[PDB]
Amino acid sequence: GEELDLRLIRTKGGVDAALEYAKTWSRYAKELLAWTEKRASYELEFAKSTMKIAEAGKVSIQQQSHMPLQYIYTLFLEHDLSLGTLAMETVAQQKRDYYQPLAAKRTEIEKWRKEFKEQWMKEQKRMNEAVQALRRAQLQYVQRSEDLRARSQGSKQQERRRRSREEAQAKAQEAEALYQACVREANARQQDLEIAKQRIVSHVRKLVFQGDEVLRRVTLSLFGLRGAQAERGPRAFAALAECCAPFEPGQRYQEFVRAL
Amino acid sequence: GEELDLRLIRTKGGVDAALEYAKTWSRYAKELLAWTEKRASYELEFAKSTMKIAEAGKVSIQQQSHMPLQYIYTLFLEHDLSLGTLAMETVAQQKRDYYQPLAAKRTEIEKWRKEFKEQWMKEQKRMNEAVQALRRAQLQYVQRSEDLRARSQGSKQQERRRRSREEAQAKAQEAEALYQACVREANARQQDLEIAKQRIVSHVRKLVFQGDEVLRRVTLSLFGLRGAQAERGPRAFAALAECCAPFEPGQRYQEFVRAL
C-alpha cells in the first residue's frame, strides 16, 4: 500500500506513470460503457422489430379457424412478444445497474485526474522558478564579487578608496546572503515536490481501488441480469415441442367438415 | 375418412368448402413462412451488428495492459461473437429444415388446388350445357307437336293431307326421341358431377393430411433447433460470474507499478 507509493515515488516519472494509469483506466471504462450502450441499442431495435411482426402474426392467426398447430403458433408468437418485453426491461435495468454507477465513478476519477495533473504542473513550475531565481542570484553575486575586487587593487584619496571598498563589500555580502537564501528556497521547493509526489500517487491508487470496486460490482450484477434473461429460452422451446405430441394430422379439417 | 368425404359430398357446396379450406391452409402456411423469414432477417442484422462492435471491442482490449477484469471482458466479448456465429448457423439451418420443406409442400397444395378448381368449373359448365341443350330440345318438341296438330284438323287432297300428317308425325317422333336423349345426357352429367365431387374432396383431404404431416415435422425440428440455441446462454453468464470471485481491486495497478 504505502510501500507501492514509495516504489513509484523513487521512480523518476512515477507521478506521470500513475496519472497515465488513471487516463488509461478511464478510457477503458469509457470503451466498456460505449460497447454495452451500443449493444443495448441493437437489442432494443431487435425487440421492437420482432414484436411488430409477432403482434401482426397474432392478429392474423386469431382470425383463422381449424388451422393445424394454431394454438402452438399462437403460444410461439406470444413467447416472442414476452422475450421482447423481457429484453426492453433488461436494457432499462442495465442502464440503471451498470451504465449509471460505472459512468459516475469514471467521471469522478477523470475530475480528480485532471485536478492532480494541474497541481503537478503547478508544483514543477514553482521548482523551475526557484532554480531560475537561484541562477540569477548566483550571477548577481559574481558581478558584486567582481565589483569588490576592482575596489581592492591598492589620505583624502585613501579615505575614499576605503569607503568604496567597504560599500562594494556590503553589496557583495548582501548578494551572497541572497544567493544562499535562494539555495534554501530551491531545497524547500524540492521537498515540496516530494510531498506532492506521495499525495498524488496515494490518491490515484485509492481512486483506482474504488473504480475497480464499482467495476467488479456492476459487472457481477450485469452477468446475473443477462443470466436471468438467458434462462427463459430453453424451457419454453422444450414445452412448445411437448405440445406437438397430441397433434394428429387431418384432425382440424375433420373438425372443419363437422362444423359445416 | 371415406365417411368425411360423404358428409361433405351431401352438403351443397362441399367441393367449394373443401377447396376454400385448401386456400385458407395455404395462406396460413404462407403467413407462417413470411413471419419466420422476416424474424430470421432481423436476427441476421442483430448478429451482424453485435459482432461488429464485439470484434472492435476485442481489438481494443487486447492492446491494453493491467486493466481490471480484462480477461473476463475478453471472454464476455468473445461469447457475444460465438452467439453471433451460432445465430447465423441457426438461421441457415432454419431456411433448410423449416422454410424449404414447408414452402415446397405449400406450392404443391396450391398447384393441386388451382387444378381441382378448373376441373370443378369444367364439370359444372358441362352440366349447364346439358341442361341448356335439354331446354332447346323440349321447346323444339313443342313446335313439332304444334306442327303435327295443325296437319290433324280433318281424294287427291286426302292423300296429300295424309302425307303432310305422316311427315309432321315423323318430325314430332324424332324431336321426342331427341329431347328424351337430352334428359338422359343431363342425367349422365349429373352422375359425372358426383364422381368429380368425391374425387376432388378425397384428394383435398389427403393433401391437407400431408401438409399437416410436413407442418408438424418442420415445427418440431424448428423448436429443437431454437431450443439448442437457447441452451448456450445461462451456463455462459454463470461461468462469467464465477470468474469474478478471485478478482481483487487494485491488484492490476499493483502489477502495473511492479512492471514499471
> The domain spanning residue A234 has which CATH number?
1.20.1270.60
What's phi and psi for A151, nearest 5 deg?
-100, 25
B240 contacts B73 by C-beta, under 8 angstroms: no
User: Which residues are within 8 A (CB) of A104 and not within 5 positions of it... i.e. 6 or more apart?
Assistant: none
- Give the residue from A173, A124, A117, A116 showing the smallest Cα distance to A147: A173
A216 contacts B241 by C-beta, under 8 angstroms: no
Q: Which cell goes with A196?
A: 506532492
B154: three-class secondary structure by DSSP: coil
- Give the residue from B205, B24, B245 showing the smallest Cα distance to A254: B205
Q: How far is it, in rounded angstroms, from Cα A184 to Cα A179?
A: 9
Q: Which cell goes with B110?
A: 396450391
Q: How far is it, in rounded angstroms, from Cα B118 to Cα B98?
A: 31
**How far is B189 from chain A, CA to nearest CA, in Å?**
26
Q: How far is it, in rounded angstroms, from Cα A194 to Cα B210?
A: 88
What Cα–Cα distance (Å) separates residue B168 from each residue in B141, B151, B156?
A: 11, 7, 19
- Last residue before each gap in chain A (C to N over 2.5 A): 154
Test mutation, A6, A7, A21, A33, chain B, max B CBs within 10 A: A21
- Method for this entry: X-ray
> CB distance B31–A230 less than 8 Å?
no
Q: Which cell goes with B94?
A: 432454419
Q: How far is it, in rounded angstroms, from Cα B250 to Cα A207?
A: 9
Number of domains in chain A: 1
User: Which residues are within 8 A (CB) of B65 and not within 5 positions of it... i.e. 6 or more apart?
Assistant: B256, B259
Query: What is the structure's resolution, reported in angstroms to one decimal?
Result: 2.4
**How far is B15 from chain A, CA to nearest CA, in Å?**
11
> CB distance B7–A258 less than 8 Å?
yes
> CB distance A253–B205 less than 8 Å?
yes
Q: Which domain holds residue A163?
A: 1-260
Q: Which amino acid is at B206?
A: K
Angle between helices B70-94 and A14-61 in degrees, nearest 10: 20
Q: Which cell goes with B191?
A: 352422375
List the Cα angle B247/B248/B250 in 5-degree steps.
130
CA atoms A33, A39, A45, A46: torsion sign: negative
A110 contacts A26 by C-beta, under 8 angstroms: yes
> CB distance A64–B258 less than 8 Å?
no
Q: What's the DSSP call for residue B11?
A: S
Angle between helices B70-94 and B14-61 in degrees, nearest 10: 160
Q: How far is it, in rounded angstroms, from Cα A6 to Cα A22?
A: 18
Q: How far is it, in rounded angstroms, from Cα A22 to Cα A32?
A: 15
- Last residue before each gap in chain B (C to N over 2.5 A): 154
- Give the residue from A29, A94, A111 showing the smallest Cα distance to A227: A94
B172 contacts B141 by C-beta, under 8 angstroms: yes
CA atoms lying within 13 Å on the CB side of residue A163: 6
A222 contacts A98 by C-beta, under 8 angstroms: yes
- Give me the residue from B215, B229, B234 closest to A231, CB to CB: B234
Q: How far is it, in rounded angstroms, from Cα A82 to Cα A72?
A: 15
- Give the residue from B112, B115, B108, B90 showing the smallest Cα distance to B36: B90
Q: Where are the alpha helices (DSSP H) in chain B?
A: 2-10, 14-61, 70-94, 100-150, 156-243, 251-259
B117: three-class secondary structure by DSSP: helix
Q: What's the DSSP call for residue A99?
A: I
Q: Considering just the CA atoms, what is the radius of gyration of chain A in Å?
A: 40
Q: Which amino acid is at B188?
A: A
Q: What's the DSSP call for residue B66?
A: S
Q: Which residues of B208-242 are buried (b: 16+ CB within 10 A; e: fewer)?
A: bbebbebbbbbbbbbbebbbebbeebbebbeebbe
Q: Which cell goes with B197?
A: 365431387
> CB distance B216–A249 less than 8 Å?
yes
Cα B255 to the chain's mean position, in Å? 67
- Give the residue from A238, A236, A221, A230 showing the smallest Cα distance to A87: A230
List the Cα angle A98/A102/A108 in 5-degree steps.
160
What's phi and psi for B22, nearest 5 deg?
-65, -35
**How far is B78 from chain A, CA to nearest CA, in Å?**
13
Q: How far is it, in rounded angstroms, from Cα B224 to Cα B217?
A: 11
CA atoms A214, A215, A216, A217: torsion sign: positive
